[PDB]
Amino acid sequence: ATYLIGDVHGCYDELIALLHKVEFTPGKDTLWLTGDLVARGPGSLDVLRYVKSLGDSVRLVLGNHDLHLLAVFAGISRNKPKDRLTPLLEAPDADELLNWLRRQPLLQIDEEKKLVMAHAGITPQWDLQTAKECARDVEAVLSSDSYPFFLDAMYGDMPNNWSPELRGLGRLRFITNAFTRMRFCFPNGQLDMYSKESPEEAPAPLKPWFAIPGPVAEEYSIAFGHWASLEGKGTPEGIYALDTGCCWGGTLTCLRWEDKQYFVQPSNR
Ligand SMILES: Nc1nc(=O)c2ncn([C@@H]3O[C@H](COP(=O)(O)OP(=O)(O)OP(=O)(O)OP(=O)(O)O)[C@@H](O)[C@H]3O)c2[nH]1
Ligand SMILES: [Mn+2]
Ligand SMILES: [Mn+2]
């Protein structure tokens, strides 16, 4: 069976309880994870160890908090105490875990399931080939010996409009923001980098990225996490918002793909 789980954010106990509820069995089942495995919750180290141990039985995409952890690890950014990353950073296998994590994709595609996953979703300005190429570019820099330079360069909110003519730092920054930070779009699909509220509370003319018709969403289902204030609600058919805010005292949500059946684990906080 195929299980998809939203942002874990170090909530290892809830993740294990949820997978035990569905009797997740590596070798018979596959787990998709929307990213943001780490930070806020207490168990980022245990989560990383477990997900890495799954190997071919897990299909991950990186989120903004995974990238921030990599920035902290590489001395690019400062550790925030509230992220609760110090046990992971000081672990004896920290190097092994983080060198694995930085080699993971930003985008997962399964053609037989007609299913696409990325942390924040797929911007309506991309078709499938463009999204594939952008994922490959950013993954290439993240898995290279020089990834700290990219991590340093990724921070920023512009440009917010895709063009195939984008080059260098702006192209890479846009790719990263589209895959890991996107929530609202302008009518022309350009990214807004400030609003984090629910679609109902957003000011005009901002609308969810999935409310703008795009070539990928027209042909594929799209699963994503990231947008906790969405609360997994209000999406059109074929759009699956899996982040229900476990680390925030909400819930950890698991979707079984074969029957679109939902399983929910309450936050322990
Ligand atoms: N209105 C509202 N309703 C809710 O139900 C709810 N649940 C959480 N939040 C807030 O939403 C903010 C964004 O957190 P997030 O939605 O979990 O997304 P993250 O990727 O974890 O960080 P991120 O920093 O936000 O992500 P990017 O910077 O990459 O966009 C947090 O500061 C929470 O306090 C809520 N707010
Ligand atoms: Mn998150
Ligand atoms: Mn996120």
mmCIF file of C-alpha atoms in Angstrom, residues 14 17-19 21-22 242 244 246 250-255 261-267:
data_model
loop_
_atom_site.group_PDB
_atom_site.id
_atom_site.type_symbol
_atom_site.label_atom_id
_atom_site.label_comp_id
_atom_site.label_asym_id
_atom_site.label_seq_id
_atom_site.Cartn_x
_atom_site.Cartn_y
_atom_site.Cartn_z
ATOM 1 C CA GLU A 14 2.926 10.621 16.551
ATOM 2 C CA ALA A 17 1.752 5.721 16.301
ATOM 3 C CA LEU A 18 0.166 6.643 12.951
ATOM 4 C CA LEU A 19 2.253 4.124 10.974
ATOM 5 C CA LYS A 21 -2.287 2.208 13.147
ATOM 6 C CA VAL A 22 -2.042 1.415 9.418
ATOM 7 C CA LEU A 242 -1.609 16.907 4.088
ATOM 8 C CA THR A 244 -2.635 19.480 9.552
ATOM 9 C CA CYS A 246 0.866 18.211 14.325
ATOM 10 C CA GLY A 250 -3.222 19.902 15.599
ATOM 11 C CA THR A 251 -2.911 16.445 14.043
ATOM 12 C CA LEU A 252 -0.636 14.281 11.924
ATOM 13 C CA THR A 253 -2.512 13.102 8.828
ATOM 14 C CA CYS A 254 -1.904 9.997 6.714
ATOM 15 C CA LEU A 255 -3.617 9.381 3.364
ATOM 16 C CA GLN A 261 -8.649 6.779 3.059
ATOM 17 C CA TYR A 262 -7.554 9.151 5.840
ATOM 18 C CA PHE A 263 -5.993 8.162 9.187
ATOM 19 C CA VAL A 264 -5.349 10.795 11.839
ATOM 20 C CA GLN A 265 -3.094 10.914 14.911
ATOM 21 C CA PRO A 266 -3.735 13.571 17.586
ATOM 22 C CA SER A 267 -0.879 15.781 18.688
#
